[PDB]
Structure 1
Amino acid sequence: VFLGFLGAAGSTMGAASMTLTVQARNLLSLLKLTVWGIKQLQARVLAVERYLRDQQLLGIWGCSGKLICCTNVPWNSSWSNRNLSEIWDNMTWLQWDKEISNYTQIIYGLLEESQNQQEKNEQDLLALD
C-alpha cells in the first residue's frame, strides 16, 4: 500500500515508519548564464548538499546502510516521558519532532560519541587476537 511522497505525514509514527523508502527515493533525485540557469545549478548543488549532510550523520552514527538502526544510547526520560504505545500509536512524526526538537542537538552528540567512537576502538581491540 503506497500513498506517495510524504503520504503518512499525518499517520501515527508506527505507520509512517513502514514507508521510509518512499521519502528516501524522492529525497535526492550561446550563454547558459540565464536567470534560470543560475537558479537551477544553484538549486541542484543545494539538494546534494542537504542529502550528503544527512548521509554524513548516518555515517558517523554507524548507520550508513540502513533506514532503521538501533543504538546504545539509552532514552533519557527528561526528553520525553511518553510510553511506547503513546508515542508510536498516538503521535505523528511532526508533533514528535516538535516535542523533541529541543534536545535533538544533545541527542545527536551522544549518538556519534557514545557508540561509534567507542565501538570502533573496542572493535579493534577485540579482533586484535
Structure 2
Amino acid sequence: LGFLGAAGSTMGAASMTLTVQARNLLSTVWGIKQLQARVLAVERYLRDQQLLGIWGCSGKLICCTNVPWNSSWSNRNLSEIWDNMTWLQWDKEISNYTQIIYGLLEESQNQQEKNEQDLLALD
C-alpha cells in the first residue's frame, strides 16, 4: 500500500498504484552536497516529463499510442503478461528493444500535429 510496495505483485495489480511512486520523484563547501543532489533531482524529473510531452502524453499516467507491437519484441499472450508476471521481470525482456520504441512513439506524434493542423486549416 505504501511507496514501492507493489514491486513484487502482478503487473495488472501494480499499475493500480502508479500515483504512489509518481509522488516521490522529487521533494559551506561541504554542504554543496545538499545542493548538487537537489539540482540533479529536478533535471531528472524534467527529462521524463519532456520525454512524455513529445509523445503526446502530456499529463497522463496511462497513455495509449498507435504504434503497432512488433511481435519480435515479445511474444507473450496478454494473460501471460498482465496476470502472472511482475514489472521487474518485464524490464528484463524488453531492455534491448527499449531505445528504438521511444523513436516510434516520437515519430507518430508530430505526424498528428502536422495532420490535425492541416485538417483545421481545411475548415
Instruction: Give the alignment's TM-score, normalised by structure 1.
Output: 0.87
Gaps of 5+ in 1: none
Q: Which moved more, 1:76-85 or 1:116-125?
A: 116-125
Q: Is the 8 A contact 1:72 1:115 kept in 2?
A: no
Distance in 2 of aligned mates of 1:66 and 1:127: 28
Deviation at 1:72, TM superposition (A): 0.5
Deviation at 1:97, TM superposition (A): 1.1
Deviation at 1:35, TM superposition (A): 4.8
Gaps of 5+ in 2: none
Percentage of identical aligned residues: 100
Counterpart of 1:18 in structure 2 is: 16
Q: What does the per-residue CA deviation read over 1:34-53, in whole Å, with 9 as the maximum and x for residues that have no partner?
A: 35421110000110111000
Moved over 4 A (4+): none
For residue 73 of structure 1, give the secondary structure of its aligned residue in structure 2. strand
Change (3 A) 1:70 1:116: farther
Instruction: Give the alignment's TM-score, normalised by structure 2.
Output: 0.91
Q: What is the root-mean-square deviation in Å for CA atoms of aligned residues?
A: 1.6
Distance in 2 of aligned mates of 1:95 and 1:120: 38
Deviation at 1:127, TM superposition (A): 5.4
Q: Is the 8 A contact 1:73 1:115 kept in 2?
A: no
Report the count of equivalent residues: 123
Distance in 2 of aligned mates of 1:68 and 1:126: 27
Distance in 2 of aligned mates of 1:88 and 1:102: 21
The answer to which structure has the higher helix fraction is: 2
